[PDB]
From a paper:
To develop an understanding of the structural basis of nanobody binding affinity, we carried out the biophysical and structural characterization of a series of six nanobodies targeting the receptor binding domain ([name]) of [name]-[name]-2 spike protein, comprising a hit from screening a naïve nanobody library and five affinity-matured mutants derived from this parental binder; two of the mutants have been shown to be potently neutralize the virus. Recognition of the [name] by the nanobodies is dominated by CDR3 and CDR2, with CDR1 only making a few contacts. At the heart of the interaction of these nanobodies with the [name] is a salt bridge π–cation interaction involving R52 from CDR2 of the nanobody and E484 and F490 of the virus [name]. As a result of binding to this epitope, the nanobody directly competes with the binding of angiotensin-converting enzyme 2 (ACE2) and thus is neutralizing.
Numbering used by the authors:
A (entry chain EEE): 334 to 527
B (entry chain FFF): 2 to 127
The structure:
């Protein structure tokens, strides 16, 4: 009864970071070894928990959050970070105790002439709370004049394309990210290691 | 992916024509559509753009108050309503499509678009 981590890590298409996807994992055996033994990953940071000790703990739910950002933004997927991604797109809590996993996806997510299909939120009235998701396309009021849903001076569309060309510097190449969160509730702990 | 234009043709000055541009084939996303025109022996020039999301429009100074760009998302079609036609409006009109999302609508006036239609003749007579 294997946890379906394959569906997340090996998905053909990933979400834009503003529209990040969550998979709820429950009622299954989690083989964390397949992840922590892999040569596929450039980032594999776990905060106060080791994939090794996960193999003898049970959780009520595990969440796998997945999306694309550029290489130099992977550092923002960590507790206590700021920047466009942490502030407006995907926010970890200060007390995060899960894992952040990332790999270069230049082969899949870039194309000659530019892949523009991956977006991020460039403007927002306030910072996201941890694990908050905002997919609104409200015209953003940068000035004192209301926009009334009409773009113009100081009235902007809040989303912006990444420009992923395969010749980009590695800092500007696409990275696929999976964030694992481990949840223990009053209810039965049914996600266990082997 | 194909952009299929229709409408336009011959109309006397002061009259109104509507151009259509239908997008066919599998698309992942559409950021914006635009109309451009090329008069014989002149460079192709921007006419109008519309953001697919929200429908905000951006116009060349030469067509403000005369032309309206609009789009039907369900029909994947963009339209140019060409009112108060002048001899200067005589040109081949091209629709264009991009998946590039800029926060800044005015960027669609100068952005190099990814996909182009075959072009549709508009001729304004006396
Ligand atoms: C993803 O697929 C590869 C085979 O292409 C496999 O080796 C890897 O373990 C898979 N990932 C997961 C988490 O199942």
């Amino acid at each position: 009864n294997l946890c379906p981590f394959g569906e997340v890590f090996n998905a053909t298409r990933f979400a834009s970071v503003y529209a990040w996807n969550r998979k709820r994992i429950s009622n299954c055996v989690a083989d964390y070894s397949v992840l922590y033994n892999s040569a596929s990953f450039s980032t594999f940071k776990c905060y106060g928990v080791s994939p090794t000790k996960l193999n003898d703990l049970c959780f009520t739910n595990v969440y796998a959050d997945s999306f694309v950002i550029r290489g130099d933004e992977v550092r923002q997927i960590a507790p206590g970070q700021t920047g466009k991604i942490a502030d407006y797109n995907y926010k970890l809590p200060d007390d995060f105790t899960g894992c952040v996993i990332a790999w270069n996806s230049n082969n899949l997510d870039s194309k000659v002439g530019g892949n523009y299909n991956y977006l991020y939120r460039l403007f927002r009235k306030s910072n996201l709370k941890p694990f908050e998701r905002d997919i609104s396309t409200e015209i953003y009021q940068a000035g004192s004049t209301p926009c009334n849903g009409v773009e113009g001076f100081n009235c902007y569309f809040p989303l912006q394309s990444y420009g992923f060309q395969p010749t980009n510097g590695v800092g500007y190449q696409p990275y696929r990210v999976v964030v694992l969160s481990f949840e223990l509730l009053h209810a039965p702990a049914t996600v266990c290691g082997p | 992916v194909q952009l299929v234009e229709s409408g336009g043709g011959l109309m006397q000055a002061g009259g109104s024509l509507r151009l259509s541009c239908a997008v066919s084939g599998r698309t992942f996303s559409t950021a914006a559509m635009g109309w451009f025109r090329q008069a014989p022996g002149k460079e192709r020039e921007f006419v109008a753009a519309i953001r697919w999301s929200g429908g905000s429009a951006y116009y060349a100074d030469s067509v403000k108050g005369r032309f309206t760009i609009s789009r039907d998302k369900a029909k994947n079609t963009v339209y140019l309503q060409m009112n108060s036609l002048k001899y200067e409006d005589t040109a081949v009109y091209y629709c264009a499509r991009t998946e590039y999302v800029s926060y800044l609508l005015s960027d669609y006036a100068t952005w190099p678009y990814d996909y182009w239609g075959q072009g549709t003749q508009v001729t304004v007579s006396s």
